[PDB]
Amino acid sequence: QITLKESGPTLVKPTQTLTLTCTFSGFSLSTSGVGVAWIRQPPGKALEWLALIYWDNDKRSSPSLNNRLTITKDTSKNQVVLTMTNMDPEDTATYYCAHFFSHYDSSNYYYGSWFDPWGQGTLVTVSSASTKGPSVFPLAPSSKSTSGGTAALGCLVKDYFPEPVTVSWNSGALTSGVHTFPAVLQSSGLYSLSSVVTVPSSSLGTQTYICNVNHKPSNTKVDKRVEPKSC
Amino acid sequence: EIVLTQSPGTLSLSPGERATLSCRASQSFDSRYLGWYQQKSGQAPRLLIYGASSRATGIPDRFSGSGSGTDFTLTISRLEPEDFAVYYCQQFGDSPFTFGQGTKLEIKRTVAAPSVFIFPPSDEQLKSGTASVVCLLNNFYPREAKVQWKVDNALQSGNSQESVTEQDSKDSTYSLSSTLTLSKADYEKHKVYACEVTHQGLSSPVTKSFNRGEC
Amino acid sequence: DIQMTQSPSSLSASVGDRVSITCRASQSISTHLHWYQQKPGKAPKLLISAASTLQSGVPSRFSGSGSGTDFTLTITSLQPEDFATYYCQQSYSTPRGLSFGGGTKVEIKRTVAAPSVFIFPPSDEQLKSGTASVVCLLNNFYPREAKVQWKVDNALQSGNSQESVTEQDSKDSTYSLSSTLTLSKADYEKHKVYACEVTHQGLSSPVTKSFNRGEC
Amino acid sequence: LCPFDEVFNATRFASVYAWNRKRISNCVADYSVLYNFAPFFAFKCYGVSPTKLNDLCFTNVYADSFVIRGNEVSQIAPGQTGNIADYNYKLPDDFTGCVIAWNSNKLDSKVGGNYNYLYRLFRKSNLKPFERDISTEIYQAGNKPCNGVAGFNCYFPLRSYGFRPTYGVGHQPYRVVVLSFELLHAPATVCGP
Amino acid sequence: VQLVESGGGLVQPGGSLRLSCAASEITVSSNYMNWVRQAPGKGLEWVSVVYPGGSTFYTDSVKGRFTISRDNSKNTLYLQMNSLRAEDTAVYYCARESGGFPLAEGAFDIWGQGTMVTVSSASTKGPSVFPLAPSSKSTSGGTAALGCLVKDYFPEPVTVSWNSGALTSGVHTFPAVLQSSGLYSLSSVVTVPSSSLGTQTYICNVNHKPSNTKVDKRVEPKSC
Ligand SMILES: *[C@@H]1O[C@H](CO)[C@@H](O)[C@H](O)[C@H]1NC(C)=O
């Protein structure tokens, strides 16, 4: 069993240079056929292989990204350093470092190769913006008496950067009917999401609902209560 | 550059039946250069099959792979509920090494009618200077559902965003949120705010309205 | 000992249609495959090298793809001057095993036209010399493949027939076929009824062109 | 005792056009390691015999190492013709010593091709025995001078092997070590135990 | 770059021949030079190769009877052929291997025009001409066929014309066929309207060059 952990600055400004370090245990970059490959997956898009370094210092890189890619190895400390220069604000993705190996059997026949287990994955975002604490708006239910005995309420969180924001309801007591939508990037380069829970209509007046959102980069904790309102 | 095309784009089936995925290559390479990887929701990809016919260590025998020339396929038989993920075909023939666009394996179930509720901006967002109205679709299937914003029955476009929640773990349904954002003058220059839901689960498209002046 | 097979042997298409030709080897030869073009009466011209590399001065419509045991030659905009023959040649076998393919012929596509079938009996001038030549002539048939048979008084002769075909015409784009039988004096003074049988796709029914020596 | 492991157990060999050469003297030369080595696709010996070279003493042992294709392994032999024999590595007809070749698809083949091994395709004349030509000058294949411009019939004289793992056995990479034994009138130094 | 082939011709079985290839703009003794043969109507077949350094390789069928050489004085390539046989009847090309601007190994970028070598003992003679009259038909849709059969001749080429070359409507010629006797046969035919069989006179002219036989014959129809 081998492991790979990626570390480094997860936030990089435009036209800057990122340096991601993959520390790997369970294998050494000095064996035959062993390699380390950096791959990136944009959010909601397919995987894209970036670079691959070998045991004998041979390196391959994507031709469309060859100019601004540089990958180096430190065998003594079991590290792979990937440097990416002139970052545009689309390069936001999740980067993985993976072990690369092939399979022969006593005659050098090469029954294929693969990417041995991948890394945890580091989210890297590019933006020429500043950190900003989130704001919470109570999305209250409409004035309905029964309407089938089912309504919904929740909290809309805006103006936070970067991901993620930890959302809990009633200090985690209530979890049924909870939908926490993924963050959406607005046209202003700013983040927002909504967390909505469905509750029976009869429970509007006999229950109080508190939503708590935690933002580590801004270290902001916001607790907001949502109650029904009438016309 | 070798281009890999997968089929189908989405595959919705319940546990028990058979699943088949196809990957076609723009060029021809040795079959030992193709592999299949699995990636769960909110996880990282992991090797499933290498050499297009060799199961990775620990992979259940339900997974099989076969292909030649420019066509390969991955076959699953006993796809139990934990076996629902996104599958990628990848090639090692020519640099750069490329992955397929992926195939999502969805859970087949009965067609559900989306419960569509509304949430107008609060007073805090009324003094924030920029307003947003959010209408929600809950517990529907399939994910395909068209939302439509109407400001005094006017076809709004481009000023609103959408966010669809992935398939639920228990009921295997979806949730969608449409957020229409406006400036204070735009918010206050009109009266009726409505959203429209079109879905297979609904017999006919369903409108729903509200009035800021009345409520 | 590597043998290359080209498919199809013949391929008819009009101007503007994308055309593909496949070359398959008996064993993997990596990318040591080359595509040559040859017009009749001229030397072959190298089009595609290393199974993917376009040569200098060649239109970009020609394209090579594939590797291992399968290779493809593709034309996108097929100009009227590109109806030549194409060969695949491998350079994998080391000692003397450089070999060419059988060659795929590319030629125009037109509407099917039925032929006109005639019979030429041998002449008295040729008869005086102890040799007899009996000819059946097919004029303006399409497509090229057709069946010709020689019924000498309802006898299906074989082994004594020589067949020739014209190159594709530049005016009507049809073909002409000549079938000849060489015979001695007894061979022509033993029988009575001579006929050539034509079976062609453009013919609704098989056609017999017959005659009798005594009457004519 | 200077063994043959530092050359056989090498992380990277040399291209055939720039084959590596190591001298060996003032040692005890055993050859059980050669038998203990890889499946040994080829182990042939001219002049000496496999069970004879262990006994007689030699003044010097010259070890030439390189990587070639499996098709050209037969070209490493006295009195042979071919591209490798003519322009990369020529063995004399009077060659005394012997040749070891073994498949190394694991090490010298990589996905997408290993372009680190080169061979010389163009040369006006045949190489002399045990000659080296490491120069990289544009080959003038016609009347028009090149003047350092590789245009039309003016070519770079070195080309890389493919060396992909999926290649056939004929085109797979093979490592080759050639041992030349010298027993000149000078007192011999290298002999077995 | 021009490669001009010369020395082709016809020889008796078991004879010898010498083929020359004069090169321009390229040095023969500096390029991989190949001889490739193509049988009439058949596909290409590699025959021999010579390396820039002097090494020569031959196919199995020609080993022991073929020799390939260069000449740096006249900058020429030479193919000496011995013990020739009917399998050697083909058009020969001298070609440059591993050239072209991309420098593709094993590919013949530059080809010569090729010369024809024939191996037969037919004792070259002249052609026989046999008329082929239109059938005893009235109109048959206003389409009649007539022609002239040139048979029992050797070798090729041969020329056939109608009305001294003044007739081209419906004119068709067919490639000569090698019969079992070593001679050749073919027919030259013309499609003419039915009404043209009465007044205008039609002739066929046949020219055979080695026998220098120039024969002009007449084609008339006959009644049954
Ligand atoms: C060194 O060579 C010996 C052969 O005696 C072999 O057993 C061993 O695996 C080799 N080790 C390395 C690191 O190449």
Side-chain angles (χ1 to χ4, degrees):
Chain A
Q1 188 254 23
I2 90 205
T3 69
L4 296 101
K5 316 262 163 323
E6 310 127 16
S7 52
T10 73
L11 200 151
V12 273
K13 333 292 307 307
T15 191
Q16 300 276 23
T17 295
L18 61 70
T19 328
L20 268 190
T21 318
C22 174
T23 278
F24 45 90
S25 98
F27 73 96
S28 267
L29 246 200
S30 273
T31 326
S32 168
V34 169
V36 171
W38 279 99
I39 300 114
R40 70 168 168 186
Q41 179 189 242
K45 313 225 216 325
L47 299 151
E48 168 138 325
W49 167 75
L50 297 174
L52 163 67
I53 194 151
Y54 282 115
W55 69 100
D56 48 38
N57 253 38
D58 279 83
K59 35 190 74 169
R60 278 196 175 284
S61 284
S62 183
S64 119
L65 268 150
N66 198 292
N67 277 47
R68 57 209 209 62
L69 250 290
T70 140
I71 170 184
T72 63
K73 48 180 282 327
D74 302 332
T75 324
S76 321
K77 320 177 288 286
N78 275 13
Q79 265 157 65
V80 176
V81 224
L82 184 101
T83 358
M84 221 198 180
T85 83
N86 312 7
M87 323 273 318
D88 288 282
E90 185 266 322
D91 278 64
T92 154
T94 296
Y95 294 71
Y96 311 87
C97 70
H99 179 230
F100 167 85
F101 209 46
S102 306
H103 174 215
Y104 309 80
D105 230 3
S106 80
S107 323
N108 300 304
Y109 183 64
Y110 182 73
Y111 328 87
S113 42
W114 58 85
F115 286 136
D116 234 54
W118 296 51
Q120 196 193 23
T122 314
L123 174 80
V124 160
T125 190
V126 192
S127 188
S128 100
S130 182
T131 325
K132 165 183 225 82
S135 309
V136 180
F137 311 162
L139 310 158
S142 178
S143 57
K144 46 217 282 216
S145 53
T146 292
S147 29
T150 308
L153 43 56
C155 308
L156 155 83
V157 207
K158 284 260 277 160
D159 313 342
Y160 62 78
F161 175 77
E163 295 169 292
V165 199
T166 280
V167 186
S168 63
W169 271 83
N170 301 351
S171 294
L174 166 63
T175 54
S176 76
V178 174
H179 279 276
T180 54
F181 288 99
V184 184
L185 190 51
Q186 289 144 101
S187 56
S188 57
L190 186 269
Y191 277 82
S192 34
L193 94 171
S194 320
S195 171
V196 153
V197 54
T198 40
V199 84
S201 308
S202 61
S203 302
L204 292 181
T206 165
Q207 189 81 32
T208 34
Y209 307 90
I210 175 49
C211 71
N212 336 74
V213 285
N214 218 4
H215 201 245
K216 288 318 102 203
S218 78
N219 318 276
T220 299
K221 193 50 185 190
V222 186
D223 315 77
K224 189 122 205 60
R225 295 171 171 184
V226 183
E227 316 173 71
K229 287 102 180 167
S230 308
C231 309
Chain B
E1 174 175 19
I2 307 182
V3 177
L4 269 52
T5 322
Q6 300 195 233
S7 43
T10 83
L11 174 58
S12 307
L13 302 160
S14 279
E17 34 271 73
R18 311 274 270 98
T20 270
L21 284 78
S22 284
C23 184
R24 259 70 34 84
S26 58
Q27 331 212 2
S28 199
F29 46 76
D30 201 329
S31 84
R32 289 170 289 162
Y33 279 144
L34 190 122
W36 291 92
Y37 290 75
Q38 177 201 49
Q39 172 201 26
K40 300 226 183 15
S41 67
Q43 290 312 136
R46 74 177 224 247
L47 169 72
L48 206 69
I49 277 170
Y50 63 91
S53 33
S54 320
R55 250 193 320 283
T57 278
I59 299 300
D61 319 295
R62 74 185 38 111
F63 298 99
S64 293
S66 1
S68 275
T70 76
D71 170 312
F72 308 89
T73 167
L74 171 72
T75 283
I76 331 179
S77 324
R78 319 297 307 91
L79 57 138
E80 49 91 29
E82 318 318 280
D83 212 15
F84 279 92
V86 187
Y87 297 88
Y88 289 84
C89 60
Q90 180 249 3
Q91 51 101 6
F92 266 132
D94 272 292
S95 169
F97 318 123
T98 42
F99 300 74
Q101 94 281 0
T103 286
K104 212 287 189 192
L105 239 66
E106 280 171 50
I107 283 177
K108 147 179 313 141
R109 58 148 284 100
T110 82
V111 199
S115 313
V116 195
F117 307 175
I118 192 52
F119 298 104
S122 70
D123 290 16
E124 179 164 305
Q125 208 186 8
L126 273 177
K127 45 201 100 85
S128 69
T130 333
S132 291
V133 70
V134 176
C135 94
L136 165 74
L137 289 66
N138 189 217
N139 284 339
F140 57 108
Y141 187 66
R143 174 208 311 171
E144 280 89 20
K146 191 35 172 81
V147 84
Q148 195 44 58
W149 278 131
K150 279 111 51 177
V151 171
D152 276 356
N153 232 19
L155 265 66
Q156 311 290 310
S157 182
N159 48 6
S160 57
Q161 282 189 143
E162 184 268 314
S163 203
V164 46
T165 273
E166 50 283 296
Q167 180 143 96
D168 257 343
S169 70
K170 288 150 298 303
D171 43 60
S172 303
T173 69
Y174 291 92
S175 259
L176 197 136
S177 55
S178 185
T179 299
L180 174 55
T181 316
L182 304 162
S183 68
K184 246 34 180 198
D186 303 327
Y187 184 79
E188 265 284 322
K189 64 181 257 289
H190 270 45
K191 198 40 47 194
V192 179
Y193 288 144
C195 88
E196 205 292 300
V197 48
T198 289
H199 182 205
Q200 160 177 339
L202 299 178
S203 63
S204 64
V206 167
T207 46
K208 67 184 217 93
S209 278
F210 79 87
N211 316 275
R212 181 226 321 145
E214 164 186 64
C215 212
Chain C
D1 59 326
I2 312 184
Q3 302 86 2
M4 327 288 300
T5 92
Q6 285 178 241
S7 188
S9 57
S10 63
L11 164 88
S12 187
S14 179
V15 151
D17 321 87
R18 213 185 97 109
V19 137
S20 152
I21 305 120
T22 261
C23 180
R24 174 200 318 295
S26 43
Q27 63 163 254
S28 145
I29 54 143
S30 318
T31 50
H32 289 63
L33 194 278
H34 318 272
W35 285 100
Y36 300 86
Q37 181 238 67
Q38 180 174 41
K39 264 160 287 261
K42 309 227 302 296
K45 172 216 184 42
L46 177 62
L47 299 187
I48 296 305
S49 73
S52 212
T53 297
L54 256 300
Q55 228 58 21
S56 168
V58 204
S60 185
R61 36 196 216 241
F62 294 110
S63 61
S65 44
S67 110
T69 179
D70 287 337
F71 308 89
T72 87
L73 198 275
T74 279
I75 304 104
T76 75
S77 79
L78 196 138
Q79 253 44 62
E81 84 272 354
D82 284 350
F83 291 95
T85 297
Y86 297 85
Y87 297 93
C88 69
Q89 178 245 303
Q90 56 92 12
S91 55
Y92 191 82
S93 299
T94 165
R96 317 99 173 172
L98 177 145
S99 83
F100 293 81
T104 277
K105 176 135 173 314
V106 181
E107 52 95 347
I108 45 94
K109 171 188 59 55
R110 51 151 289 148
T111 82
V112 27
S116 212
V117 186
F118 312 65
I119 270 286
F120 302 150
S123 48
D124 230 17
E125 183 232 347
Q126 192 206 0
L127 267 213
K128 310 195 309 312
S129 44
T131 316
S133 280
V134 199
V135 171
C136 177
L137 166 61
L138 277 74
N139 228 191
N140 278 358
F141 55 91
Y142 190 81
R144 169 189 285 184
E145 56 282 80
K147 186 46 72 170
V148 296
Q149 216 294 330
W150 276 95
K151 298 175 184 183
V152 180
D153 206 346
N154 217 26
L156 267 62
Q157 314 278 354
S158 180
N160 53 19
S161 206
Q162 306 246 213
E163 171 252 302
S164 323
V165 99
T166 307
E167 193 59 322
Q168 211 160 41
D169 204 350
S170 58
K171 287 119 102 184
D172 295 26
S173 299
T174 48
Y175 299 93
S176 303
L177 193 134
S178 340
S179 43
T180 327
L181 274 37
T182 287
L183 299 166
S184 50
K185 273 318 171 142
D187 271 350
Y188 208 94
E189 302 327 298
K190 188 193 144 262
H191 275 266
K192 262 196 180 194
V193 158
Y194 295 116
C196 78
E197 196 29 41
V198 262
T199 305
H200 176 254
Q201 285 104 291
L203 293 189
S204 69
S205 67
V207 159
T208 171
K209 281 325 215 255
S210 323
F211 83 90
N212 204 27
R213 182 217 313 149
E215 165 184 76
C216 203
Chain D
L1 167 54
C2 51
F4 295 120
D5 222 38
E6 73 283 39
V7 43
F8 281 68
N9 276 9
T11 274
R12 200 215 287 286
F13 271 42
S15 294
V16 64
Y17 93 99
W19 44 273
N20 258 324
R21 170 165 266 191
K22 172 191 259 343
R23 207 169 56 53
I24 285 138
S25 68
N26 309 28
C27 297
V28 51
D30 86 5
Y31 307 93
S32 278
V33 192
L34 282 309
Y35 277 44
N36 187 265
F37 224 54
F40 259 45
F41 159 82
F43 190 177
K44 41 192 50 42
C45 300
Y46 312 107
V48 316
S49 116
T51 181
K52 177 39 208 143
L53 39 72
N54 220 3
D55 326 302
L56 84 168
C57 201
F58 288 116
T59 65
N60 280 301
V61 187
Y62 268 105
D64 294 358
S65 275
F66 53 82
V67 161
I68 41 150
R69 267 198 277 247
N71 280 135
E72 323 151 327
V73 168
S74 84
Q75 281 188 47
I76 315 295
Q80 214 90 314
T81 29
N83 188 67
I84 299 302
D86 287 358
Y87 319 123
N88 298 279
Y89 188 82
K90 190 44 157 66
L91 270 195
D93 278 44
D94 85 84
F95 176 71
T96 300
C98 90
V99 178
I100 289 133
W102 69 98
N103 176 281
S104 69
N105 198 35
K106 208 163 283 155
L107 309 141
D108 306 294
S109 277
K110 296 191 185 104
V111 280
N114 180 35
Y115 305 111
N116 289 332
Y117 293 109
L118 270 51
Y119 64 91
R120 166 174 316 263
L121 179 82
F122 286 118
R123 225 179 150 283
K124 309 288 222 208
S125 170
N126 267 42
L127 278 195
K128 259 54 172 278
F130 295 131
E131 208 161 29
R132 259 159 71 81
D133 197 45
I134 66 125
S135 71
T136 87
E137 319 287 80
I138 289 307
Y139 190 77
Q140 183 215 342
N143 287 16
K144 246 78 55 193
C146 310
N147 318 315
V149 169
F152 199 158
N153 15 13
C154 282
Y155 311 116
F156 194 80
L158 305 182
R159 310 213 47 85
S160 103
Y161 295 104
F163 290 166
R164 285 175 199 249
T166 205
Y167 279 176
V169 116
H171 269 37
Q172 271 169 41
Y174 285 63
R175 292 178 168 201
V176 172
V177 180
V178 160
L179 300 184
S180 175
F181 299 103
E182 262 58 32
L183 84 186
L184 307 102
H185 321 89
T189 54
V190 209
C191 9
Chain E
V1 171
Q2 195 112 17
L3 264 43
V4 214
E5 323 290 10
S6 191
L10 78 98
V11 284
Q12 272 77 21
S16 69
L17 249 165
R18 168 179 219 75
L19 303 169
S20 304
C21 180
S24 324
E25 295 140 74
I26 56 158
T27 325
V28 153
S29 116
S30 181
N31 292 264
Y32 293 74
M33 292 319 279
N34 303 55
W35 284 98
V36 190
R37 79 148 88 107
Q38 165 175 27
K42 259 44 67 200
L44 300 169
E45 195 217 48
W46 174 80
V47 157
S48 163
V49 69
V50 57
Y51 281 14
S55 308
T56 58
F57 301 91
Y58 305 80
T59 202
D60 55 26
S61 57
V62 310
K63 278 214 251 296
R65 5 167 240 128
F66 277 11
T67 241
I68 182 169
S69 323
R70 303 110 55 107
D71 204 313
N72 307 18
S73 206
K74 294 96 49 171
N75 189 30
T76 39
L77 188 63
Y78 282 127
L79 180 49
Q80 180 69 53
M81 306 155 95
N82 288 300
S83 333
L84 289 143
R85 27 204 175 146
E87 289 107 12
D88 280 45
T89 324
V91 179
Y92 285 77
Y93 299 102
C94 128
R96 204 264 296 268
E97 170 191 348
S98 78
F101 169 56
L103 196 283
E105 316 146 50
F108 310 92
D109 45 315
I110 288 154
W111 288 71
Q113 82 259 0
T115 61
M116 165 66 98
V117 152
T118 311
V119 218
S120 167
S121 55
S123 289
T124 283
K125 68 158 303 189
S128 310
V129 220
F130 302 133
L132 294 177
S135 191
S136 55
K137 33 167 188 190
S138 60
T139 190
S140 307
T143 307
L146 80 76
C148 288
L149 154 70
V150 190
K151 218 171 47 55
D152 314 349
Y153 74 75
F154 187 90
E156 305 279 290
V158 60
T159 223
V160 199
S161 85
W162 289 90
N163 287 135
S164 308
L167 193 56
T168 43
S169 277
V171 160
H172 297 117
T173 50
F174 311 101
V177 279
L178 182 72
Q179 313 149 124
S180 68
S181 64
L183 282 302
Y184 285 111
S185 183
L186 49 82
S187 312
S188 187
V189 285
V190 59
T191 291
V192 86
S194 298
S195 60
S196 285
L197 307 195
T199 53
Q200 48 273 87
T201 88
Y202 299 124
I203 64 144
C204 42
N205 156 56
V206 191
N207 194 78
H208 193 239
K209 72 214 154 63
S211 55
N212 230 39
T213 299
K214 309 166 262 303
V215 163
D216 283 57
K217 274 286 315 322
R218 287 188 160 202
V219 262
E220 333 300 308
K222 296 94 178 171
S223 301
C224 309

